Amino acid sequence: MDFRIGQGYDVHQLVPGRPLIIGGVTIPYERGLLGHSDADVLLHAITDALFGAAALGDIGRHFSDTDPRFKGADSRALLRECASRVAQAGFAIRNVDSTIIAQAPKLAPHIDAMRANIAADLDLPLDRVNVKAKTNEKLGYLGRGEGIEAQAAALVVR
Amino acid sequence: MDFRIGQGYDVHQLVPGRPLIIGGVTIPYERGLLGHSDADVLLHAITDALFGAAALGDIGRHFDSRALLRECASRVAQAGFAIRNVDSTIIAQAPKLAPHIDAMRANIAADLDLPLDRVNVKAKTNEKLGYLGRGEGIEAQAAALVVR
Amino acid sequence: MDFRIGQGYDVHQLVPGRPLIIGGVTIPYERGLLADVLLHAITDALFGAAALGDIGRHFDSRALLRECASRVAQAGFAIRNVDSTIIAQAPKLAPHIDAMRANIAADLDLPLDRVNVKAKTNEKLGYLGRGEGIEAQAAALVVR
Ligand SMILES: N[C@@H](Cc1c[nH]c2ccccc12)C(=O)NO
Ligand SMILES: [Zn+2]
Ligand SMILES: [Zn+2]
Ligand SMILES: [Zn+2]
């Protein structure tokens, strides 16, 4: 009954010449997310929520964003390693919820694939993983398509 | 002991000619929230947090925002979950929301068949920053705890 | 087994001529907040988990956090954990995280391993990315 909650946030700029990878899904699009890694904003937010629930710091503490070994890093591999460290700390994952905010492209066709990827990486059934997709109702830099944001919440138990 | 958490986010533009309805409360104001529904940003954020905790997707996949919140609660129950508590924040530079918070909590508690002491609504400004600080929209955030 | 969750949000403008205090820590930097954004978010998350309203209805931001914790306890709740994120484009916050965690854990009378603080930039986007403000987000779990 030693439950703990974590929360996560990430944002990346949307720029030409990059793959668009969200929730482990390579989405065909003229632009992609800019980062040292593959810039998977959704997986990073979930990773942060998991480290946070376990009181293990944050994604930047665990994976160096200047190490050449993480250039173009597969963020699913990072999420699996996060889950491994959370387990080593003594915690079991109970559920993850998340939101992606993007003006474009349409994300609804890809949500089920993202959910399946996250569930596989966390060794969870599909019914403990949720991904919600939103626009920002045309407001701000999100409404202008300059970046994509993700939010996440995770419940774990020791 | 099968607890789950959900989180929700919503934002809508403030435009002339619409009533301002937040948490089911009609607030006197020169503008109101723009949307296909009544654009109740707080009820939508709570609805998304409840769908998220139950792993039932989101408000866009599933659909007056109180009727929608009641239907969301029905679908959460249909999945086998009981709602334990909801917490939330509204971010608006104007108008003042404190006089309306208790009516909002009462509306949410009635719609979710919860006691008042399991529902919470918090009010914030954005310190004059961004589109929220310029009064161009209102944001809501929500967290929900459920149990199977 | 009567668990409850709360969530908190705060933001303040960042301009020259003020000290930068986050999580009770004075951080060397050319600008400061116009205002402890992290402690307020945590305070709001705790009031929210207890269904006691918000920081504006109830009230140094450390003294406020300690009083918030006292009211949460008198309402019958024990705090189980806090997690949080600070979004600031500059300065680097990683060197101060342990000091922030120590201050929060002390104020909440929690073991250190139940308090977490995460740090992010906003990738140069928006008022946060331009260094015009700093945001904090928080989540708290309590039990009656
Ligand atoms: N959002 C941050 C999270 C992060 C920090 N250090 C890392 C190292 C590898 C991958 C991601 C990270 C980022 O750098 N994405 O590319
Ligand atoms: Zn990232
Ligand atoms: Zn809405
Ligand atoms: Zn504040």
TrEMBL record, chain B:
It catalyses: 4-CDP-2-C-methyl-D-erythritol 2-phosphate = 2-C-methyl-D-erythritol 2,4-cyclic diphosphate + CMP. It is an enzyme of class 4 (lyase). GO terms for biological process: isopentenyl diphosphate biosynthetic process, methylerythritol 4-phosphate pathway; terpenoid biosynthetic process. Binds 1 divalent metal cation per subunit. Zn(2+) binds at residues 10, 12, 44. Pathway: Isoprenoid biosynthesis; isopentenyl diphosphate biosynthesis via DXP pathway; isopentenyl diphosphate from 1-deoxy-D-xylulose 5-phosphate: step 4/6. 4-CDP-2-C-methyl-D-erythritol 2-phosphate binds at residues 10-12, 36-37, 58-60, 134. Its EC number is 4.6.1.12. The record marks 36, 125 as: Transition state stabilizer. The keyword Cell inner membrane does not apply. The keyword Zinc applies. GO terms for molecular function: 2-C-methyl-D-erythritol 2,4-cyclodiphosphate synthase activity; metal ion binding. Its cofactor is a divalent metal cation. A divalent metal cation binds at residues 10, 12, 44. Residues 3-146 form the 2-C-methyl-D-erythritol 2,4-cyclodiphosphate synthase domain. CDD domains: MECDP_synthase. InterPro entries: MECDP_synthase, MECDP_synthase_CS, MECDP_synthase_sf. Keywords: Isoprene biosynthesis, Lyase, Metal-binding, Zinc. It comes from the Bacteria. Belongs to the IspF family. Homotrimer. Involved in the biosynthesis of isopentenyl diphosphate (IPP) and dimethylallyl diphosphate (DMAPP), two major building blocks of isoprenoid compounds. Catalyzes the conversion of 4-diphosphocytidyl-2-C-methyl-D-erythritol 2-phosphate (CDP-ME2P) to 2-C-methyl-D-erythritol 2,4-cyclodiphosphate (ME-CPP) with a corresponding release of cytidine 5-monophosphate (CMP). This is 2-C-methyl-D-erythritol 2,4-cyclodiphosphate synthase. It comes from Burkholderia pseudomallei (Pseudomonas pseudomallei).
From TrEMBL, chain C:
Pathway: Isoprenoid biosynthesis; isopentenyl diphosphate biosynthesis via DXP pathway; isopentenyl diphosphate from 1-deoxy-D-xylulose 5-phosphate: step 4/6. Homotrimer. It catalyses: 4-CDP-2-C-methyl-D-erythritol 2-phosphate = 2-C-methyl-D-erythritol 2,4-cyclic diphosphate + CMP. This is 2-C-methyl-D-erythritol 2,4-cyclodiphosphate synthase. InterPro entries: MECDP_synthase, MECDP_synthase_CS, MECDP_synthase_sf. Keywords: Isoprene biosynthesis, Lyase, Metal-binding, Zinc. It comes from Burkholderia pseudomallei (Pseudomonas pseudomallei). GO terms for molecular function: 2-C-methyl-D-erythritol 2,4-cyclodiphosphate synthase activity; metal ion binding. Residues 3-142 form the 2-C-methyl-D-erythritol 2,4-cyclodiphosphate synthase domain. Its EC number is 4.6.1.12. Involved in the biosynthesis of isopentenyl diphosphate (IPP) and dimethylallyl diphosphate (DMAPP), two major building blocks of isoprenoid compounds. Catalyzes the conversion of 4-diphosphocytidyl-2-C-methyl-D-erythritol 2-phosphate (CDP-ME2P) to 2-C-methyl-D-erythritol 2,4-cyclodiphosphate (ME-CPP) with a corresponding release of cytidine 5-monophosphate (CMP). Belongs to the IspF family. It holds the Pfam family YgbB. The record marks 121 as: Transition state stabilizer. Binds 1 divalent metal cation per subunit. Zn(2+) binds at residues 10, 12, 40. 4-CDP-2-C-methyl-D-erythritol 2-phosphate binds at residues 10-12, 54-56, 130. GO terms for biological process: isopentenyl diphosphate biosynthetic process, methylerythritol 4-phosphate pathway; terpenoid biosynthetic process. A divalent metal cation binds at residues 10, 12, 40. Its cofactor is a divalent metal cation. CDD domains: MECDP_synthase.
